[PDB]
Amino acid sequence: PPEEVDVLVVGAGFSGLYALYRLRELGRSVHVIETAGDVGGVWYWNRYPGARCAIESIEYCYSFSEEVLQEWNWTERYASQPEILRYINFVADKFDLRSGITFHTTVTAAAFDEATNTWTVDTNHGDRIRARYLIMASGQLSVPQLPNFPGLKDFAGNLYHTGNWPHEPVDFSGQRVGVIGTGSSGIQVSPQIAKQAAELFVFQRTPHFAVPARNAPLDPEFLADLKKRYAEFREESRNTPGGTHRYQGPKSALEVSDEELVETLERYWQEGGPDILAAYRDILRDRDANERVAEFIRNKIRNTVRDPEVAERLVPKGYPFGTKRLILEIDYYEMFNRDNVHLVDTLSAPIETITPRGVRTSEREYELDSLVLATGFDALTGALFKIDIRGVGNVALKEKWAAGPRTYLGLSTAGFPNLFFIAGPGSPSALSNMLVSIEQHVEWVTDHIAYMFKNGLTRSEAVLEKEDEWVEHVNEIADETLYPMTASWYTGANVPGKPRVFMLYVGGFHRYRQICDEVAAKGYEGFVLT
Ligand SMILES: Cc1cc2nc3c(=O)[nH]c(=O)nc-3n(C[C@H](O)[C@H](O)[C@H](O)COP(=O)(O)OP(=O)(O)OC[C@H]3O[C@@H](n4cnc5c(N)ncnc54)[C@H](O)[C@@H]3O)c2cc1C
Numbered sequence: 001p002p003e004e005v006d007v008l009v010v011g012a013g014f015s016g017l018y019a020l021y022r023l024r025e026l027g028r029s030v031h032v033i034e035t036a037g038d039v040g041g042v043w044y045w046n047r048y049p050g051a052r053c054a055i056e057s058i059e060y061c062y063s064f065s066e067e068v069l070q071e072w073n074w075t076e077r078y079a080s081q082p083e084i085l086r087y088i089n090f091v092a093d094k095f096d097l098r099s100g101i102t103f104h105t106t107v108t109a110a111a112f113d114e115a116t117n118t119w120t121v122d123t124n125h126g127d128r129i130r131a132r133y134l135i136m137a138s139g140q141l142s143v144p145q146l147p148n149f150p151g152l153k154d155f156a157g158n159l160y161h162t163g164n165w166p167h168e169p170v171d172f173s174g175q176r177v178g179v180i181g182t183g184s185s186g187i188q189v190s191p192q193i194a195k196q197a198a199e200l201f202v203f204q205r206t207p208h209f210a211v212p213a214r215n216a217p218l219d220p221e222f223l224a225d226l227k228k229r230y231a232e233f234r235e236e237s238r239n240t241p242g243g244t245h246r247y248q249g250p251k252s253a254l255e256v257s258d259e260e261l262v263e264t265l266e267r268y269w270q271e272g273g274p275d276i277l278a279a280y281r282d283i284l285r286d287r288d289a290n291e292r293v294a295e296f297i298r299n300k301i302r303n304t305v306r307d308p309e310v311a312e313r314l315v316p317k318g319y320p321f322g323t324k325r326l327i328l329e330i331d332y333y334e335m336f337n338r339d340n341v342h343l344v345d346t347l348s349a350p351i352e353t354i355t356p357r358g359v360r361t362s363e364r365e366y367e368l369d370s371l372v373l374a375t376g377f378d379a380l381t382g383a384l385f386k387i388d389i390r391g392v393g394n395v396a397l398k399e400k401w402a403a404g405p406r407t408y409l410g411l412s413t414a415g416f417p418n419l420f421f422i423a424g425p426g427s428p429s430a431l432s433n434m435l436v437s438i439e440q441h442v443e444w445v446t447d448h449i450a451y452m453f454k455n456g457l458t459r460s461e462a463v464l465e466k467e468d469e470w471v472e473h474v475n476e477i478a479d480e481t482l483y484p485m486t487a488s489w490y491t492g493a494n495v496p497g498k499p500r501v502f503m504l505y506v507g508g509f510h511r512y513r514q515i516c517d518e519v520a521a522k523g524y525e526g527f528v529l530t
């Protein structure tokens with residue numbers, strides 16, 4: 001890795017690879033540092049069986065390259081992780097991206113030097129790079145989180161986390177296997193494992209809402225047709241709250257009769273996918289509205305499993321539909337109908353400790369040959385906090401953000417000039433199709449950088465007052481929805497001791513992009529440039 005560079009980029013997943021590509025195109029020196037052996041980010045790390053995207057392949061893809069759009073052939077309604085990894089390798093090879101990337105290398109600290117207006121960045125290999133701009137493309141869901149209980153290191157069997165899955169197939173044949181966590185990771189990994197294991201124990205805490213994916217082959221007519229209008233189709237997706245073609249249902253879940261509700265929701269349930277989140281305009285705004293939808297979903301869940309005792313344990317309760325990430329399930333509910341699959345309800349009987357033989361609840365011991373941790377991620381701030389980042393006056397990012405992330409547009413933080421966060425806290429981030437949130441942040445940041453070199457500036461900084469205004473705005477629009485009142489990773493609720501604040505912008509990607517454009521249009525209002 002070079003000793004000096006215009007822009008250093010941390011992370012080689014979607015965000016990082018695009019930042020590299022566009023920056024070269026703008027004629028800036030740029031280099032990328034990445035912990036992993038190769039490119040991919042989440043689709044490199046998350047190789048557990050059943051790993052699949054929950055945005056339709058034709059939406060969840062880059063649009064910066066008409067060539068890539070014309071050449072790539074997706075195959076399924078929802079792409080499996082290995083296909084998305086092939087796609088990302090395709091794009092990397094096409095634009096020759098690896099010559100710009102150092103792999104196997106973890107950034108450990110970065111400190112801003114006020115005299116030079118530059119960042120000096122250090123790695124666990126002892127490299128030191130001096131860069132004018134520092135782009136953290138280091139992910140949202142990139143640091144695995146272990147669950148909160150002892151005896152983990154004592155377990156005699158094999159121990160896995162889904163976000164750090166082995167690079168070659170793991171064989172569960174004839175095993176007694178435990179999965180802890182039933183987020184989308186656990187929901188995807190579990191039916192795969194149940195095919196091999198002599199017995200599978202699924203350790204559920206709060207149940208998550210899941211609806212049928214109804215995956216299907218992609219019609220190759222449809223692909224070829226779509227391509228003729230691809231750039232147009234994408235543009236429609238950029239002009240939405242969600243970054244996809246999801247239908248924005250006009251009515252209120254409350255204005256309709258029961259019969260019309262069932263019938264409309266029945267159509268979504270048969271169709272499959274996440275679009276039901278926008279069946280009515282107020283599902284995420286009004287608790288009575290939300291509840292009518294949630295109830296319809298709970299009953300479909302009940303009717304999915306024959307033992308009604310086991311079915312009632314699968315019904316999510318205590319939090320509004322859609323306020324933890326919606327999950328797309330494939331034969332997950334069906335799975336509890338098998339002899340060798342066991343739902344362990346750890347709300348009724350909490351896990352007390354892992355033992356050398358298995359798992360202890362307050363009710364009994366569970367002997368196991370392997371334990372799979374589907375326990376999620378220290379989300380949104382996790383990766384940043386693992387790095388000793390220091391701004392003006394030696395302030396640690398970790399400390400300034402200790403009560404929750406403070407940003408302007410989520411893009412930068414006051415006190416830390418020349419530093420940009422891709423698709424993180426204070427922006428749409430994971431509340432969209434992330435390829436659309438990711439391209440828009442990469443273009444805005446890399447445009448900002450180009451504008452800086454153009455007009456002769458060397459220092460970009462969020463104005464503290466606008467940040468404070470932005471933080472309060474994010475919180476106040478979040479408080480008009482039901483989002484903040486549920487314990488989700490959006491809220492930091494899954495890391496012990498982490499401050500409970502809703503971390504994402506909820507006003508929709510479209511409106512967020514309009515605001516960013518007005519900002520850059522006025523020469524970057526809310527930034528101070530010198
Ligand atoms: C299992 C899973 C499924 C998902 N499914 C969807 C989906 O269906 N729809 C959707 O819109 N989004 C989904 N997401 C969200 C996902 O975060 C984004 O879609 C997108 O892949 C994020 O890309 P990225 O480049 O920003 O971050 P990442 O892909 O996470 O890349 C960050 C990279 O930075 C590296 N890194 C972090 N810190 C350092 C450091 N200190 N030094 C060097 N390298 C570092 C990591 O190794 C990683 O490779 C999913 C995420 C996960 C984990």
Ligand SMILES: NC(=O)c1ccc[n+]([C@@H]2O[C@H](COP(=O)([O-])OP(=O)(O)OC[C@H]3O[C@@H](n4cnc5c(N)ncnc54)[C@H](OP(=O)(O)O)[C@@H]3O)[C@@H](O)[C@H]2O)c1
Pocket residue numbers: 052053054055141146147148149180181182183184185186188205206207325328374375376377430489494
């Ligand atoms: N496209 C996809 O289908 C897909 C697949 C995987 C991941 N993702 C992305 O990644 C996000 C995270 O998914 P995820 O399933 O990995 O993690 P998650 O949504 O954060 O779920 C973690 C799970 O582990 C359980 N858990 C956590 N801590 C525990 C503890 N201390 N004791 C007992 N149980 C514990 C949680 O229970 P509680 O809920 O009760 O806390 C939850 O069931 C998703 O929401 C999505 O954004 C997407």
